[PDB]
Amino acid sequence: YLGRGAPPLLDNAAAVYLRNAVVAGNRLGPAQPVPVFGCAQVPRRAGMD
Amino acid sequence: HGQDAVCEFIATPVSTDVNYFRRPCNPRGRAAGGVYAGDKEGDVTALMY
Amino acid sequence: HQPLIARDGPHPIEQPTHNYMTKIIDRRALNAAFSLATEAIALLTGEAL
Amino acid sequence: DGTGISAHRQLRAIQQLARNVQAVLGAFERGTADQMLHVLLEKAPPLAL
Amino acid sequence: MLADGFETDIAIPSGISRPDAAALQRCEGRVVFLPTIRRQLTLADVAHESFVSGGVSPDTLGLLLAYRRRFPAVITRVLPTRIVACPLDVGLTHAGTVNLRNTSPVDLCNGDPISLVPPVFEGQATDVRLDSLDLTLRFPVPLPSPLAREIVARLVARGIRDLNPPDLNVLYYNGSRLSLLADVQQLGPVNAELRSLVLNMVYSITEGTTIILTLIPRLFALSAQDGYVNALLQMQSVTREAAQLIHPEAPALMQDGERRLPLYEALVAWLTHAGQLGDTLALAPVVRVCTFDGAAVVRSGDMAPVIRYP
Amino acid sequence: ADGFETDIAIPSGISRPDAAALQRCEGRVVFLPTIRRQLTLADVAHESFVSGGVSPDTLGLLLAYRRRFPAVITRVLPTRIVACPLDVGLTHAGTVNLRNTSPVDLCNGDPISLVPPVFEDVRLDSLDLTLRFPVPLPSPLAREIVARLVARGIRDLPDLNVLYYNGSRLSLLALGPVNAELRSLVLNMVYSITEGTTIILTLIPRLFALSAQDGYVNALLQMQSVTREAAQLIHPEGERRLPLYEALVAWLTHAGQLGDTLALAPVVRVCTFDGAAVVRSGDMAPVIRYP
Amino acid sequence: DVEFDALLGSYCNTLSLVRFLELGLSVACVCTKFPELAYMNEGRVQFEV
C-alpha cells in the first residue's frame, strides 16, 4: 500500500475496506495516506530495542 | 536466615506466552523508559501508553 | 583541542573545533570529638595542685 | 591602540591562527593515512575468495 | 541591497539583570519582526508588548496578519550595548549568507524554502522573558515551506468549524507524529482569512472550467486503470464521491469560440488566484537553505547557511 | 578576486568526439545538488535525477529545479569544468555570458526563467551518461508556453500552436513522445481545479444557481467589500458526512504544492551593453542578477 | 567581612604533530611528491612483464 503502482479494484466500498484493515494498525503502514508523487513515510517509533 | 523478602502479586491473563518470561523482561506488559526513548518532548510517556 | 583528519567528498568538510570546560569546586568538611572531663580542667590549670 | 590591552589582544588573535594552522597542516599527513587504508580496502579481496 | 548591506541596531535599555543578559546571548540566531526599516529602535519595539494590537491580545491565527504587516529580520550578533540585525526584504548582507539557529522540531534539507510560523506546537512553547525590563519575547519557528502551508490550512479549517454549531489536529512529516496547541480563535481575523479565501476561490472560475468539469467522469474511469490516478482522490476528496453521483456535460456552443481559447483562459486565471493563495494567507517563503560544506540534513538545534529565495 | 567558482571534474577516458561536444556547450544552464568547490560530473547528468527505476518526467524536473541549484558554465578546460552558481557567485562579479538554446529571441531588459526541455540532447558514449540542458526563455512567455501545452492535454481527453513574440512565428506542434512526457502535469491540473470547483460550490451551494449578471455582482460586491459583514454572506448554516474540512486541507496543500512549481521566478535578467538589443538564437547574452 | 572567588589552574591539550613516516604503514607505499599534479591530464604508468 506504500507502493502505489498497481491499479486498485473497482468498487471503492471494497478497495478502502482492505486499506483500513491492513494499514491499521500495522507497524509499517502509512500514517497519512500516500502523496500523489512523493515518497510516503513510515511513522516514527517512540523507542528502539 | 536473613531479612525476609516480600513478594508482590500482579493480576495477569492466563493465555500469555511463557516464552516472554524465559528471557529478562518487565512485570509490566510494556517496556518502560527512559533509556529507550529518543529526542522528542513526548517520547518518554509515549513509550508507556 | 580536537585533532582533525582530512577527507575527500562527497560527504562534507570539517573545521577545527575547540572546547572550554569549567568545573566548580565541591566543598566538604569534617568533625571530631575531643571532650574532656570535670576535674581535668583544674588538674591542668592548678586549682587542685 | 597604544594600550597594553589592545597589544595583549593580538596574542589571543595570532595564536588563534597558530592553533588552527598547526591542526590543519597536521591534518593532511593524517589525510594520507586515512586514504592509505581506503585504497587498500578497495583493492584487497577477502581471504575465503 | 547596498554595497555594504543595511544593518539595523536595536538598542538595549541600561537596566539589566545579569541573568537576562545571558538570556539574550542565547538568541544568537532568531527571527525578529521589525515594524519599520528604521536604523535605530528599542527592545520595547521588538518585544511582544508593542507587538500586541490596540487593547486586544492576538491569537495564533490572528498573528499571521500581524507578521505580513511587519518586516522579518534576523539577529546576527549580540553585543553588550545593542543587538545588530539584518532585514530580509532588504538585501540581507554584504556576503549573501546569514546563520539561522533552528528553534524547530523538524530538521531541514537543502534547497527547501523557509516560511515561518508562530509558536503553535505543544510542549516546545518557549518564550524568552526579560524580567528586569518586564518584557516577553515570542519568537517565530522557521519551518519548510510545504509544512507552513499545511499548518495555515489546519488552523483556517479549524475556525470554519466554529461558525457551524472531527478531527483536525494531527500532522505528519518525516514520519513524525505531532499535534498543535490552540484553544480559541478570535472571530475578527478568521473573517479576514476567510474573505481572503473566497475572493480568490471565485476568481478561478471562468468559462473553460465547466469544460474541465466534463472530465470528472474521465478521471474516475482512469483511476481504475492506473494507480498514479489513484494517488489523486485519496477517498477524502469530494471529487471521488462527486463523480459517483453527478454526470455533467458541456455547454454548447460558446460565444465567439472561433477567436478565443476558453481552456487556456481558465488556467491562467487559476494560476494567478488559487495557485497564488499559498502566498496570500501566510507570508512569503523569502529564504531557502544552501549548505556549503554539504550537509544534507540540518539538525534541530543547529545553525544553517541562508540565501534568499526570489 | 573573491569570485566563487565550482570545479566539476571529468572522469578520464574521453574519446576525441566526446570532448568536442563538451567544448561546444560553453554557455548553458547546469544544475547541481549543493554549492561546493569540487564536485563530480555524475551529479550533473540527467541520470542523477531519477527516483527509481523511473526516468523523471516534466513534473519532476520542475520539482527538482527548486531543490537543484542553477549554474552557468564558464570556460571549459580539458581538465575540469569551471561553472559559477547563479545565486551566490554572481553577486560579486555581476556579468556572465549566456547562450540561448531557445529559438525565441531576447530583447533588452527582459526577465528570463528556466524551463525544462519540454518545448524541444547531448549524450556521452565513453562516460555512459546523458545531458539535458534547460531552456532559458522569457518569464511572461513561460507562464504562457507551459499553459498552452497543458491546454493541449485536456483536448486529449482553433489553433493552440500560435505564439507570436517580438515579430516571430512559433510552432508548438513542429509530437509523439512530448505528449506522454507531459501527462502527469495534466492530471494534477484537473484534479486541483475540480476539487477547487466542488468545495467552493459546496460551501456556497448556489454560485451557479444564482441569477445572472446582476444578482451575482451584488453577491460579488458584498463579498468583495472590506466591511465587517463577512461570515453571514458565506456559510449555508446515521447519515454519512461529506469530509469537507479535511478536503479543504488536502486541496490547499496540493494547490500550495503547485505554487512553487509554476511560479517560474525571474532568476536571470539580461542587460545588453555595447551591442544590439535583440539577442538571437545561439548568441551569448550578458546576465545581471538582482543586486 | 571578607569574601573572594578564585581560579585554580588552567589545563590544555597538546595536539600531537604526526609525521606520516612516523608510521610504519608507509612501508606499504612509495610516497613521492609532485609539485604539480592538477595540471596533468595523462596518468599512465608503463608496466613491463
- Cell, residue E63: 498573528
Q: Which residues have C-beta within 8 Å of that of residue B44, sequence separation ≥ 6?
A: B33, B34, B37
Resolution in A: 4.3
- C42 φ, ψ (degrees, to nearest 5): -70, -20
Breaks (C-N over 2.5 A) in chain E follow: 165
User: Count of CB atoms within 10 A of residue B3's CB?
Assistant: 5
Mutate to test the interface with G, among D32, D40, D41 (most CBs of G within 10 A): D32
A3 touching B (Cβ < 8 Å): no
Closest residue in A to F253 (Cα) is: A35
Residue A47 C-alpha, separation from nearest chain F C-alpha, in angstroms: 30
Determine, for residues B42 and E124 on separate chains, whether the beta-carbon distance falls below 8 Å: no
CA dist E222 and A8 (Å) reads 11
Q: What is the 3-state secondary structure (H, E, C) of E67-112?
A: HHCCEEEEEEEECCCEEEEEECCCCCCCCCCEECCCCCCCCEECCC
Q: CA nearest F55: which of F229, F184, F156?
A: F184
**Long-range contacts of E237-241, Cβ-Cβ distance < 8 Å, separation of 24 or more:** E237/F191, E237/F195, E237/F247, E237/F250, E237/F251, E238/F195, E238/F198, E238/F199, E238/F202, E238/F242, E238/F244, E238/F247, E239/F191, E239/F194, E239/F195, E239/F198, E240/A12, E241/F242
CA distances from F76 to E200, F4, F22, F102 (A): 49, 16, 8, 21
- Cell, residue F57: 518526467
Q: Which residues have C-beta within 8 Å of that of residue E190, sequence separation ≥ 6?
A: E61, E62, E156, E159, E160, E162, E163, F231
What residue type is assigned to position F152 of the chain?
R
Mutate to test the interface with G, among F37, F38, F79 (most CBs of G within 10 A): F79
What is the CB-side half-sphere exposure of residue G44 using CA atoms within 13 A?
Answer: 5
- Cell, residue E222: 482512469
- Strand F129-131 to F122-124 pairing: antiparallel
What residue type is assigned to position D16 of the chain?
Q
- Cell, residue A9: 479494484
User: Count of CB atoms within 10 A of residue E258's CB?
Assistant: 6
- Enter the DSSP assignment of C33: -
Q: How many E/F residue pairs have CB atoms within 8 Å?
A: 202
CA distances from E155 to E73, E120, E165, F247 (A): 25, 10, 18, 14
Q: CA nearest F163: which of F222, F102, F117?
A: F102
- Cell, residue B49: 501508553
Q: CA nearest F63: which of F188, F179, F180, F169?
A: F188
Determine, for residues F231 and E293 on separate chains, whether the beta-carbon distance falls below 8 Å: no
Report whether F84 contacts F90 (CB < 8 A).
yes
CA dist E243 and G49 (Å) reads 77
Report whether F72 contacts F84 (CB < 8 A).
yes
How far does CA C1 lie from the centroid of its chain? 24
- Rounded to a whole number, what is the largest CA-CA distance in chain F? 77
- Strand F6-9 to F38-40 pairing: parallel
Determine, for residues E293 and C12 on separate chains, whether the beta-carbon distance falls below 8 Å: yes
- Cell, residue F88: 551566490
Q: Quick check: helix, strand or coil at residue F172?
A: coil
Helix (H) or strand (E) holding D41, with range, is helix D29-43
How far does CA F280 lie from the centroid of its chain? 21
Report whether E238 contacts F247 (CB < 8 A).
yes
Cα of first residue to Cα of last residue in chain F, in angstroms, is 18
CA distances from F45 to F7, F142, F170 (A): 15, 24, 29
Report whether F124 contacts F240 (CB < 8 A).
no
Mutate to test the interface with D, among C2, C4, C14, C18 (most CBs of D within 10 A): C4
Identify the experimental approach: cryo-EM
- F84 φ, ψ (degrees, to nearest 5): -110, 135
> Strands (DSSP E) along E12-165, which ranges?
31-34, 40-42, 71-78, 82-87, 98-99, 108-109, 113-117, 128-130, 135-137, 141-144
CA distances from E141 to B39, E31, E90, E121, E185 (A): 18, 8, 21, 10, 20
Report whether E126 contacts E300 (CB < 8 A).
no
CA dist F190 and F194 (Å) reads 6
User: Count of CB atoms within 10 A of residue E177's CB?
Assistant: 16
Q: CB-based burial of residue F228 (10 Å sphere; 0-12 exposed, 13-18 middle, 19+ buried)? A: exposed
- Cell, residue E109: 534539507
Residues of chain C in contact with residue G12, where contact means CB-CB under 8 angstroms, are 1
- Cell, residue G44: 599512465
F178 touching E (Cβ < 8 Å): no
Report whether F179 contacts F173 (CB < 8 A).
no
Q: Which residues have C-beta within 8 Å of that of residue E152, sequence separation ≥ 6?
A: E64, E281, E282, F252
CA dist D47 and F245 (Å) reads 64
Residue whose C-alpha cell is 531588459: F109
Q: CA nearest E6: which of E79, E61, E73?
A: E73
- Cell, residue F185: 502535469
CA dist F182 and F288 (Å) reads 32
Residue F189 C-alpha, separation from nearest chain C C-alpha, in angstroms: 38
Q: Quick check: helix, strand or coil at residue E240?
A: helix
- C35-46: b or e for each residue (b if 16 or more CB lie within 10 Å)? eeeeeeeeeeee
- Cell, residue F214: 446582476
Helix (H) or strand (E) holding F285, with range, is strand F284-288
E268 touching F (Cβ < 8 Å): yes
| Cα three-residue angle E75-E79-E85, rounded to 5 degrees | 20
Residue D48 C-alpha, separation from nearest chain C C-alpha, in angstroms: 31
- F69 φ, ψ (degrees, to nearest 5): -120, 125
Helices (H) and strands (E) in chain G, counts: 0, 0
- Strand F135-138 to F80-85 pairing: unpaired
CA dist F19 and F39 (Å) reads 19
CA distances from F35 to E291, F46, F83, F115, F179 (A): 7, 18, 11, 21, 34
Helices (H), chain F: 16-24, 58-67, 90-93, 139-155, 176-181, 183-203, 215-224, 244-261
Q: CA nearest E185: which of E48, E280, E63?
A: E63
Closest residue in B to E122 (Cα) is: B41
Helices (H), F25-155: 58-67, 90-93, 139-155
Report whether E308 contacts E287 (CB < 8 A).
yes
Report whether F116 contacts F65 (CB < 8 A).
yes
- Cell, residue F21: 561536444
Report whether E269 contacts E203 (CB < 8 A).
yes
CA dist F95 and E222 (Å) reads 50
Determine, for residues A36 and E230 on separate chains, whether the beta-carbon distance falls below 8 Å: no
- B14-26: b or e for each residue (b if 16 or more CB lie within 10 Å)? eeeeeeeeeeeee
CA dist E113 and E287 (Å) reads 6
Q: CA nearest E75: which of E87, E65, E66, E61?
A: E87
- Strand E135-137 to F122-124 pairing: unpaired
What residue type is assigned to position A42 of the chain?
V
- F16 φ, ψ (degrees, to nearest 5): -50, -35
- Cell, residue F105: 529571441
Q: Which residues have C-beta within 8 Å of that of residue E173, sequence separation ≥ 6?
A: A41, E106, E147, E150
CA dist B3 and F228 (Å) reads 79
